[PDB]
Design a protein around this nucleic acid. Sequence first.
DNA 1: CCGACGGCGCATCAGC
DNA 2: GCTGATGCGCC
DNA 3: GTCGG
Length: 326
Amino acid sequence: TLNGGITDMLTELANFEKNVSQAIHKYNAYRKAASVIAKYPHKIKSGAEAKKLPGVGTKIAEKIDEFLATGKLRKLEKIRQDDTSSSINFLTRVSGIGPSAARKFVDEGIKTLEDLRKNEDKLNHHQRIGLKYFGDFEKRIPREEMLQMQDIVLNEVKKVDSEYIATVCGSFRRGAESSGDMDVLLTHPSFTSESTKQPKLLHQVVEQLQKVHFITDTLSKGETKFMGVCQLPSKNDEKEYPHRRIDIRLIPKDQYYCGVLYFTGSDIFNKNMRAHALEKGFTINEYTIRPLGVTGVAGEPLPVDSEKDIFDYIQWKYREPKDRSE
DNA sequence: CCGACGGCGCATCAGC
DNA sequence: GCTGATGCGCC
DNA sequence: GTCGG
Ligand SMILES: [Mg+2]
Ligand SMILES: [Mg+2]
Ligand code: NA
Ligand code: NA
């Protein structure tokens, strides 16, 4: 974090554009600039030096110059004083409240943690649970705790059926010392791109993890994705562990590499990699990499035998999970 | 200049 | 109920 | 907001 002030500034601006302006590309441009500045291995001395980086343009260079000379950004100071922007930015922090629901709550004077707490009946289920664990969800997970959570999830999955493979992805798989939540890829031989020879493959794993009190709440649940809450068990007289967001994603077994690429991330790495795919005339999702056709239509799935194959197609040297933290 | 920016799962809603 | 759009989330 | 065409 040589340019910590700068990238904090940009992230804050990205958050404004997402939550308040609802200008998603502006959010993206900012997060992108932030990301390329974050791995730039020199302490930046000027806007004009940052502008050299791909993703830093004119406006962001000016902001960088204003930030370096004065330690501040006047544009952010204003945004920070605005009641309506601070309100919206705060509400969107609850999982399940985004830009639209946030603005809509303000329209009604529901705008503080205390307002939300007297008004649970105006929240859908996801939002009610996000408010419930509001504080907990702010806390990072140390790797040590990620490691116990893993043994639990790997062992319980093996118990339902010895042929499920669960793989912890996300920043954990990227070797991060702490993680915002747990991301779990799940496969079973019965579920492939050809057929689903067994129903409830995801359900059964969820039920199991509820039966051991590991999974405590559900934000959303379908046939391939679970989005919910979990908690490590604590010992006699210990304060409890914080509750933690868990995400479980069931992926056809023969598409494990595109799935594990996807779920390892980071989000920005994915966006850039996928963006580059397109320039190379391919498209990648969590399932397959397909060529782009002359017209603009996705051709057939290309054969993939490792994460590296995916990189090969798009003419990128391999990058280990730990080098994907953009 | 100016079009395009990654891709998709689930909850929810409107319109039929 | 179905189908498709919009909201929100995941990386 | 930035970039390639
Ligand atoms: Mg995570
Ligand atoms: Mg997660
Ligand atoms: Na640039
Ligand atoms: Na939110």
